[PDB]
């Protein structure tokens, strides 16, 4: 196919220095994209999570209603609004009648806060970790493409026709290999650096998200259905007991009242 022959002849003639330049520019663009879309956003998320955790720990000793108001005001303005709404919907408010009004005396947790402030929604989707965990491999592939191409250019240009041309051919081949190795070096160093930065940032993100969800989970205690069932069982037991006692008391009252009626009838007679 003549088109393939034309492409081959037109890319044998590419200047060898243009391949490391292309690799370096593309890898630099990928690294800048990594910094903008992953590292800065991860730092921002970590700082926000730490601020949230400090805010939650400041109402550990507050009343349930003021705690709810504080958390609503904390989360209603930020991206963690629907997660907070779901978490609050999962909460159970216990009411006790005080001074003729029903007031929330305790709030109970029916599900862990991590089921609403999930690692996915709060970290993975915002940071595109699913993709950025492949970025070091992308950089490695760019490096191998550039390196293999540069070494191929050097090898095509290497042809000592006589023993007297060996020196210049060796020099040109070494220059070409230098270009290819520069491209490969930058690409692989960028890959390693991106791996280091992204793994450290994702570890910190997960740690501080766990701290945040643990702070949320410590506000409200679970197991409200178990205590409701225990109260029901107790109330049933004293319900049988009180039924028996009420029957006995009614019998005693009826006996006494009938004796009084008999005495009154005797007095009248």
């Amino acid at each position: 196919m003549s088109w393939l022959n034309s492409i081959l002849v037109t890319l044998t003639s590419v200047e060898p220095y243009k391949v490391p330049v292309t690799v370096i520019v593309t890898v630099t663009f990928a690294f800048v994209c990594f910094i903008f879309f992953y590292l800065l956003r991860s730092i921002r998320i970590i700082y926000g999570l730490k601020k949230y955790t400090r805010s939650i720990n400041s109402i550990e000793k507050s009343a349930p209603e003021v705690q709810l108001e504080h958390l609503k005001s904390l989360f209603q303005r930020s991206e963690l609004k629907h997660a907070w709404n779901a978490f609050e919907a999962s909460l159970h408010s216990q009411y006790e009648l005080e001074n003729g009004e029903e007031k929330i005396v305790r709030i109970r947790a029916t599900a862990p806060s991590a089921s609403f402030f999930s690692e996915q929604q709060l970290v993975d989707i915002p940071l595109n970790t699913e993709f950025f965990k492949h970025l070091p491999g992308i950089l490695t592939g760019m490096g191998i493409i550039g390196t293999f191409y540069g070494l191929m250019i050097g090898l095509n240009h290497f042809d000592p026709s006589t023993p007297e041309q060996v020196s210049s051919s060796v020099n040109n081949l070494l220059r070409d290999v230098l270009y290819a190795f520069l491209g490969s070096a930058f690409a692989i160093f960028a890959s390693i650096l991106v791996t280091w930065l992204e793994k450290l940032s994702i570890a910190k993100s997960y740690k501080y998200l766990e701290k945040f969800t643990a702070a949320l989970d410590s506000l409200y205690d679970s197991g409200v259905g178990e205590e409701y069932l225990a109260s029901l069982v107790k109330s049933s037991n004293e319900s049988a007991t009180q039924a028996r006692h009420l029957k006995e008391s009614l019998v005693t009252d009826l006996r006494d009242m009938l004796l009084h009626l008999a005495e009154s009838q005797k007095i009248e007679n």
Partner: protein, 246 residues
């Protein structure tokens, strides 16, 4: 019914890049590097004698080019009639060296050019480059293939003998501005004789010329001492045996 809402969990823990593949890429890169550098070392070693010979040849070429440039600059500074062709190590006197039919003489321009170029070549040879790479000066004679071979060759040899005489004849202007050591050097560095046939020029009159062609030592010769000989000091002035009045 009474299922636990607070269950044991496990996140999306992605496993790292398999160590074998990065290690094997490292090993293959190392092997490719090894074979490249071994090829470079082997090719340099097998051709190091060729490289040394080529470097020596290039150095000799540079030295010869420098000597030719110096001699050409001296000729330009002193006598414009002297033109030197550095491509093939030739000294030409075309206009002043034109030879008429059946004659071995030249105009005063050729005599002035020769007696002016001889000291320049002597001082060039006295230099280190001349003392290391300059051999004796070969005299060139050109003849045509037409006519009688014997008569044309006799004309050429008469021309050469006349040139040698004019170089080393008594009463010559060259001998007035010469010393004994310079005369001995001229006698040593000049040999007479040589005929040739060429068809690289379109004019038969072009072959009626004399040109100075110097030759240089080879790399493997390197100025063998036993080749040289000696001459006794000049005792009587040289007299030409050719027919000056004709």
């Amino acid at each position: 019914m009474f299922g636990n809402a607070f269950g044991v969990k496990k996140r999306r823990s992605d496993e790292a890049e398999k160590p074998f593949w990065i290690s094997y890429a490292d090993l293959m890169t190392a092997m490719m590097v090894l074979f490249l550098v071994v090829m470079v070392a082997s090719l340099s070693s097998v051709t190091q004698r060729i490289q040394r010979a080529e470097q020596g040849e290039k150095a000799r070429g540079q030295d010869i080019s420098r000597l030719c440039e110096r001699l050409e600059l001296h000729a330009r500074n002193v006598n414009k009639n002297i033109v030197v062709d550095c491509h093939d190590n030739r000294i030409s006197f075309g206009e002043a060296g034109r030879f008429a039919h059946n004659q071995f003489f030249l105009n005063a321009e050729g005599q002035k050019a020769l007696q002016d170029v001889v000291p320049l070549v002597l001082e060039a040879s006295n230099s280190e480059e001349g003392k290391k790479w300059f051999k004796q000066i070969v005299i060139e004679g050109f003849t045509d293939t037409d006519g009688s071979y014997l008569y044309n060759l006799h004309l050429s040899l008469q021309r050469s003998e006349w040139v040698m005489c004019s170089l080393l004849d008594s009463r010559s202007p060259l001998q007035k501005n010469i010393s004994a050591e310079q005369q001995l050097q001229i006698r040593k560095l000049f040999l007479a004789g040589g005929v040739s046939f060429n068809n690289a020029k379109e004019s038969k009159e072009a072959s009626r010329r004399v040109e100075l062609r110097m030759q240089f030592f080879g790399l493997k010769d390197k100025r063998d001492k036993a080749d040289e000989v000696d001459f006794p000091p000049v005792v009587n002035k040289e007299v030409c045996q050719l027919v000056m009045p004709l």
